[PDB]
Amino acid sequence: EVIPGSTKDAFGVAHIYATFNDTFVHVTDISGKETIIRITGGMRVKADRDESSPYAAMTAA
RNA sequence: AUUAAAAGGAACAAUUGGGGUGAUUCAGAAAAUAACGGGAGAGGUGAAAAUCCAU
């Protein structure tokens, strides 16, 4: 049925921190002390030069 | 022993001054620590490597 801990339509905040050497997609709650899922551009690539590629950003997003 | 220099100095009235000295006072970036979430990467480069990470 429902995923444990999940609720109905709610609000989150995404902390998109994208440098020239990597990119971060990080969503938390309204408080900001609880993180839901944090995926970076380096987890969806193999080489170190593509972590900043726009392709890795959408894949993580 | 002349006058009162678009020479100079002094005085006064109004101001100007990130001019100087002392005290007071505000800011948050960076970094450090404390606690919590998360769970595999992070830095850095032309590409990497050395380095940091399951303590």
Side-chain angles (χ1 to χ4, degrees):
Chain A
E1 312 298 283
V2 80
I3 305 308
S6 51
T7 52
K8 295 341 305 293
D9 203 318
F11 252 89
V13 46
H15 305 279
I16 301 174
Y17 171 38
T19 91
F20 264 98
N21 277 330
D22 204 21
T23 165
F24 296 74
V25 202
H26 184 156
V27 299
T28 75
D29 63 12
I30 308 298
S31 86
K33 225 175 187 174
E34 284 311 289
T35 165
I36 317 301
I37 178 70
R38 164 194 54 216
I39 312 295
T40 71
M43 328 193 161
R44 302 306 180 226
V45 290
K46 297 169 38 144
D48 253 326
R49 58 171 214 79
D50 322 287
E51 337 183 279
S52 292
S53 60
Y55 191 49
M58 24 178 273
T59 301

